[PDB]
Amino acid sequence: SHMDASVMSTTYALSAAQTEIWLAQQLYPDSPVYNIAQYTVIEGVIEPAVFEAALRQVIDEADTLRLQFIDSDDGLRQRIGTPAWSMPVLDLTAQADPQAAAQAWMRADYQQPVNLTQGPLFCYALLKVAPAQWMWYQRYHVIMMDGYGAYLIAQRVAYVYSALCEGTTPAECDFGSILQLLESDAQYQISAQRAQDEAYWLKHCANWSEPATLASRSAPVLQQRLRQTTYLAIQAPDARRLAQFMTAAMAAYLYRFTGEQDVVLGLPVKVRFGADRHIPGMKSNTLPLRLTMRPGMNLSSLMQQAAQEMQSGLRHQRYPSEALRRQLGMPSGQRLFGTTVNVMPFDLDLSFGGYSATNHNLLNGPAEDLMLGVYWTPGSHQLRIDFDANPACYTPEGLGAHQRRFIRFMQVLAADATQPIDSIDLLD
Numbered sequence: 001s002h003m004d005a006s007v008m009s010t011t012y013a014l015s016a017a018q019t020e021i022w023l024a025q026q027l028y029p030d031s032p033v034y035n036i037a038q039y040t041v042i043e044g045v046i047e048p049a050v051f052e053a054a055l056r057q058v059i060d061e062a063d064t065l066r067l068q069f070i071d072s073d074d075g076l077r078q079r080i081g082t083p084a085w086s087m088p089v090l091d092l093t094a095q096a097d098p099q100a101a102a103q104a105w106m107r108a109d110y111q112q113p114v115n116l117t118q119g120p121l122f123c124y125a126l127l128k129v130a131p132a133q134w135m136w137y138q139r140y141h142v143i144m145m146d147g148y149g150a151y152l153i154a155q156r157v158a159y160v161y162s163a164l165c166e167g168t169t170p171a172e173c174d175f176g177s178i179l180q181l182l183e184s185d186a187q188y189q190i191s192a193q194r195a196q197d198e199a200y201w202l203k204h205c206a207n208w209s210e211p212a213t214l215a216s217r218s219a220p221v222l223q224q225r226l227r228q229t230t231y232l233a234i235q236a237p238d239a240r241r242l243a244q245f246m247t248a249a250m251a252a253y254l255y256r257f258t259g260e261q262d263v264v265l266g267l268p269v270k271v272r273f274g275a276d277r278h279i280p281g282m283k284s285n286t287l288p289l290r291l292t293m294r295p296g297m298n299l300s301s302l303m304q305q306a307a308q309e310m311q312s313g314l315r316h317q318r319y320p321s322e323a324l325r326r327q328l329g330m331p332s333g334q335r336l337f338g339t340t341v342n343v344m345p346f347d348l349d350l351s352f353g354g355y356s357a358t359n360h361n362l363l364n365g366p367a368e369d370l371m372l373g374v375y376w377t378p379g380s381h382q383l384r385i386d387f388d389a390n391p392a393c394y395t396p397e398g399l400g401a402h403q404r405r406f407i408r409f410m411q412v413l414a415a416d417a418t419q420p421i422d423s424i425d426l427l428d
């Protein structure tokens, strides 16, 4: 049939990362766990018609927002399309609990199933929760947006809105096109770079243990994450050393609870080199990071190991960890890591028409087991630490107990970096 021929002729293949997302989503086409979402709280007055004009401009500028997915013989295909969208504006200020009402509205959306061929794949909404307090809600399916991409979009919307508010022309966007990102990925899939990367990871992981984990069971994730959130003063570094510390601390904690001495963690990374640093879309990967719990090691030796792992492996970060699992001949369902340490050193602050604003994550993708999410504006004296967990594997209270124990443990670690991790009392 000519209609199938025309679909193939007018579309692009999924990238490697998108393909892994599509396959995972196909296993549970009703699981909403492939959404990411956040809201930006603005301390001021937002004019919705100007905000919507800013969103129209950024939907033109970031063409990943206009991707449409179409089923095909060779699987899912995509093109720059004409997605239907609107921007709900809800004034909740007369409600008994406007904040709770806003959270419930956002939650109702990000729990909605997202059919990839019908969309909508993103949602933008404005919620007024007090006099001079607005929330801009942002939701994406990860097949077309990752964390850094969402950050780029929020920065650009704030800038464009600010220009439109003051009646000036926004300076030209520095975004590249998603089609260039897809073409570069297609070339990488058949490049020599990829073969070197594959060799590196096959060597690095070639003798693997079943992952160390705090859970009594491992299970696919079907449900949205259980989340425990704690805010931490930084007195308890740059992004790289914050990641070194967080991975070392989580590995030491896993070792103290399970005794496992070969600890493999997941390290989400941006996979954004060169031009791809300016293209909103889905690029990110998650790397296996191995830390060997030796007899007597302290925090310093562990962060030494983590720094070495990152210096050795970040250059090879393009190689998808799912492809790595297949190439290693791992059994179906078996993972290289259970616990992931997702450090997001992305500026949380924005300015909208001269009004201060801050970003707050709602969903950060699927929680297969446990994910430590760390949100830090570089330079700030404050961290947000999320424990995101598979509800099939943890309880809210058990997760909260783990998070309190972990926060205390990590503070005692940072208090004396020469002290043996075996010598530290926990909270139990």
Ligand SMILES: CCCCCCCC(=O)SCCNC(=O)CCNC(=O)[C@H](O)C(C)(C)COP(=O)(O)OP(=O)(O)OC[C@H]1O[C@@H](n2cnc3c(N)ncnc32)[C@H](O)[C@@H]1OP(=O)(O)O
Pocket (backbone or CB within 6 Å): 036, 037, 038, 138, 139, 140, 142, 146, 147, 148, 150, 151, 239, 240, 243, 267, 268, 269, 270, 271, 272, 273, 274, 284, 310, 311, 314, 315, 316, 317, 342, 343, 344, 345, 361, 362, 363, 364, 365
């Ligand atoms: C809607 C709300 C949003 C929801 C969020 C969505 C959540 C998701 O599921 S998506 C993932 C979100 N998380 C992230 O993006 C994680 C970001 N964090 C990280 O990447 C790691 O924690 C972190 C901090 C260690 C990365 O450190 P970083 O310094 O940025 O490393 P990175 O730039 O990637 O690579 C550096 C290394 O790459 C190597 N490299 C190879 N080629 C190059 C090249 N052309 N250029 C530069 N470096 C290169 C180098 O060896 C380099 O090392 P060095 O500069 O010292 O010589």
